[PDB]
Structure 1
């Protein structure tokens, strides 16, 4: 039998996918997770005890972003191994394609939290290879179900590209994307590109946004804003065509935005 339900913080969450918590753990009905250190436990009683003893009230590593009560922590898999393993097992409950859980040393993890008087509460994360041959600026990205559809995922995507910009390089999420992942990246790419054509070659857009030319082209194609002339993709849009898309119900602007002023981060 698999883990099919977790209790974390004040939430109970049903699993979407198999996650390889150890047999005894992963043959318990429900796992209880400390929302701060992500230790997983078998019993309500061991969970209650731990809550009284655990002194963590935020993720480990460095707080590299903080605006109002939104916080991002940068966590090196090498320095912070158990925590990152616990994070990956948690993540795997909601990711179909994640294959890596214990071998966390090659990754850096960016943890999103909502802060209040009690502590910094985990919302989601993304992982990123320290060295990615495929130029992936995201390995996996996950927002916990009770926080989904509220702009946190868009925030993390935007955040991952701010990192890429600061690294002066283009980046793309590692494939295959979930359907939810595709919806979110298509939505993000479209907004960013449209806004850049409201207020330019594909080469220029890629340099300005750190979106890869491939992702720009596929996005522009879905928007019918590219012409194809003898094997070159050429941007073809009118400033009013741009604005029709942005003004429609399709593109909302009530986001949480990444404020570069609140980002404390120097490139690897």
Structure 2
């Protein structure tokens, strides 16, 4: 028997996929997680004890972003092996194609939290290879189920590209994306490109430089917006500024409820 339900903070969440917690953890009805340190436990009694003993009120690592009550923590998987091993076992419950759980040192994880008087509550995260051969600025990304479809997912994507911009480099997420992944990325890419095309002759490589979105990713977005022509084996951006405004005004695209503010980011490569 696999883990199939978890209790974390005040949420219970059913699992979507196999996650390789040790066998005897699968045995239990629920898995109980500390919402701050992410320690997993077998019983409500050990959960309650931990709750009253644990001193953590936020993720480990560095708070590299604070705007209002949204915070992002940078955790190095080398400096915090166990926390990150726990994060990965948690994420694998909802990510089908996540492969890495124990070998965490090559990764740095970015933790989205919303803060109240009690502490900083994890809402989602994305991991990133420290050095990427394939040029992936995200390895895995995930908004926890009860928080999905509220702009946290898109905040994370936005954020992963803000980091790429400060590294003066283009990047694409590791594939395959989930269906929620695909939709959120195509939506983010769309909004970013449309917003910019509103404000005069920019090549696709010019757009790639400004946004840190790869040329393939810009091309495939522009195709779905119907703003790219094919000429002699070359993708040519063909934009009618009325159809740009047309698109924006529509329902499909809009400022996410919540956005990355480059000012409130305290990070450098």
Cα offset for 1:255? 2.2
Unpaired runs of at least 5, structure 1: none
Cα offset for 1:133? 0.3
Q: Which residue of 2 aligns with 1:42?
A: 42
1:7 equivalenced with 2:14 (yes/no): no
Deviations 1:105-162 (A, max 9, x none): 0000000000000000000100000011000000000000111100000000000000
Deviations 1:32-77 (A, max 9, x none): 0000000000000000000000000000000000000000000000
The range that moved more, 253-262 or 58-67, is 253-262
CA contact (8 A) 1:225 1:236 kept: yes
TM-score, length basis structure 2: 0.98
CA contact (8 A) 1:2 1:29 kept: no
CA contact (8 A) 1:32 1:44 kept: yes
Change (3 A) 1:252 1:228: same
Cα offset for 1:180? 1.1
Unpaired runs of at least 5, structure 2: none
Over the residues paired in the alignment, what is the CA RMSD in angstroms? Answer: 0.7
Cα offset for 1:29? 1.9
1:52-71 equivalences under 5 Å are 52-71=52-71
Deviations 1:134-193 (A, max 9, x none): 000000000001111000000000000000000000000001111111011001100101
1:92-241 equivalences under 5 Å are 92-199=92-199, 200-241=202-243
CA contact (8 A) 1:140 1:174 kept: yes
The runs of at least 4 aligned residues of structure 1 exceeding 4 Å deviation read none
Q: Distance in 2 between matches of 1:167 and 1:27?
A: 45
CA contact (8 A) 1:60 1:73 kept: yes
Q: Distance in 1 between matches of 2:240 and 2:162?
A: 28
SS in 1 for 2:3: coil
Q: Distance in 2 between matches of 1:7 and 1:222?
A: 40
Cα offset for 1:253? 2.2
Cα offset for 1:254? 4.5
